[PDB]
Every structure is written in C-alpha cells, then in structure tokens.
C-alpha cells in the first residue's frame, strides 16, 4: 500500500503484515486522527518556510 500514492500518508509510510499500514510524521510533527495528516508541534518544523506559512 505505501508504494501506491504513498499509502495516502502526508509524510512517511510503513507496511505491516495483513491489510495494514501506518503513517508517521517527522520530528516536530504529530499525526492527526485521520491517520494520514501531519501537523506541526513546534514553531519551526522542518521543510516549512515561516514567512510563507
């Protein structure tokens, strides 16, 4: 599933045995209850441009 459309994950994806996958987020982010989206948890998360955010 992770190889197809990133498994639906906004960031990182792991496959598990069975019809199972888990999305994960980089440090400075947390995964939302949709199980796919990542939201910053700190002021300067990686890969975002403050003056544009």
């Amino acid at each position: 599933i992770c190889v197809n459309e990133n498994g639906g994950c906004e960031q990182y994806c792991s496959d598990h045995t069975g019809t199972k996958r888990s999305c994960r987020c980089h440090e400075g982010y947390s995964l939302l209850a949709d199980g796919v989206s990542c939201t910053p948890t700190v002021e300067y998360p990686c890969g975002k441009i403050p003056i544009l955010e």
Partner: protein, 254 residues
C-alpha cells in the same frame, strides 16, 4: 546558479554558506540545529580544518542584517567509499560546534525516510536548487542567494539525452541528473554542496546535493546531483554518534 532568480530573503531558510578563511567555498543544507549536509568534494583541498565556517540565514553577501548565524564546523564526515578528485559518493555530513537557533530565517530542510524518498519524492518532477555560485559559466558568483526550478531525469533518459564525452564520469546509482540540455539553466561549481529540495504535500525535503557537471549550463548536458536517498541510514546513524577528536572523519559506507 545559471538562469534562476533571487531566492526571496527567508524563502530558502535551510541554505548554508560554507567559508574557508572568510572565502566562499560551497553551499550546504541544514537538516536539524547542529547538522549540515554538503558535498564531499568541497573538502578535497582543505588545509586547515579549523578555519571552516558555516553560515545560516545568509542572503545578500554584501551586507550584514542581523539574521546571519555563523558556526565553527566541528566535524566533517565523509563516506569511506568517496575518493578525492572523483565523482562517486559525493556527500559530507557536518556537525556544527554549537547549534543554530531556529528563526524565520533559519529552518532545517527535512531529511526524508529512504522508502518515502525512493517511492514518492523521486517521482516529483521539479525541485529547487540554490546557491551563491556563478551566474554564468566562467562568470562572477552571485551576491544574493539564487534559486532555480529543475526537472529530474531517470538516468537512462539522462544518458540518452546527453552529448557524449569520451572521458565522462559514469552516472552511478548514487547520482541523478536534473536540469536542461539547452544551455539555459543549471547549478554551477560555486553551488556545490547546496540543496536540491523537493516539495510534497506542503513540506520540503532533501533529495539531492549539487555535485558535478560538464561546465555549467553546457548545451547537451545536465546537472548531476548526489542521490541523497542512498545515504539516509548512513546519515541517521552518524547523527546518533558522539563526536570524535579531529575534524575530518571517514566513516564506513554502507
């Protein structure tokens, strides 16, 4: 950078400027508050490792505006497989002596997981390359940070689309091509070590390092970039390690 534009101040906040005795050496990419990714080949001629400085929050080299942060480089880590004066395995991990302070003008680029980078980021067509390198082949370097959008090629396509140079280096699995063959747009030697940054779903990631090419924006040739995805596990392991005396460290690869 040839054929790009000025990166508006603060819109390339992960860009690093490397200096040796105050002189421009190379670019780099901040990936957390103490770690910078650059190109191994930037260090082929270093005599005194203790005069290497990394600058974050830089924009216009002619002025000081207070957003700049300079740090000594405590460690330069190069893969065992890199041979000075050759092209393969062109990556360096630099530990700063003291962390930088994250601000609106200083922000790391995300170092992606390998699987994500190979499966997803590698298929994002356009990515940004940046630096204070030459604005023209055989021309002066830029005073303001420049950025350029370049498309990535599969290596077989790069080879088919490139003009042949008997001596040419091999494009290996630790490299990829990006850019244009019409002589209009490329990174250049002064951009060496800088980011090739790829956007996905609102966030930017490190996918390449400015590495080499035949001239800069030479008709029939593309830019060649270190394929960062090959080095994720190597980098992560080193970032978990304690510093060792002496700036240069050769570390086993894989």
């Amino acid at each position: 950078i040839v054929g790009g534009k000025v990166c508006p101040k603060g819109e390339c906040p992960w860009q690093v400027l490397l200096l040796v005795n105050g002189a421009q050496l190379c670019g780099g990419t901040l990936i957390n508050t103490i770690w910078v990714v650059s190109a191994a080949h930037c260090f082929d001629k270093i005599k005194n490792w203790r005069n290497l400085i990394a600058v974050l929050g830089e924009h216009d080299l002619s002025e000081h505006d207070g957003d700049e942060q300079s740090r000594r480089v405590a460690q330069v880590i190069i893969p065992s497989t890199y041979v000075p004066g050759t092209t393969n395995h062109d990556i360096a991990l630099l530990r700063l002596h003291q962390p930088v302070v994250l601000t609106d003008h200083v922000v790391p680029l995300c170092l992606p997981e390998r699987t994500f980078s190979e499966r997803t980021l590698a298929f994002v067509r356009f990515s940004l390359v940046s630096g204070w390198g030459q604005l023209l082949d055989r021309g002066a370097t830029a005073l303001e940070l420049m950025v350029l959008n370049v498309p990535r090629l599969m290596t077989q396509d790069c080879l088919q689309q490139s003009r042949k140079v008997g001596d040419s280096p091999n494009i290996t699995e630790y490299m990829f091509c990006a850019g244009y063959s019409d002589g209009s747009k490329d990174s250049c030697k002064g951009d060496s070590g800088g980011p090739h940054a790829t956007h996905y779903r609102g966030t930017w990631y490190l996918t390449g390092i400015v590495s080499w090419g035949q001239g800069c924006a030479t008709v029939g040739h593309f830019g060649v970039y270190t394929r960062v995805s090959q080095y994720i596990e190597w980098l992560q392991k080193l970032m978990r390690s304690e510093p060792r005396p002496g700036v240069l460290l050769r570390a086993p690869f894989p």
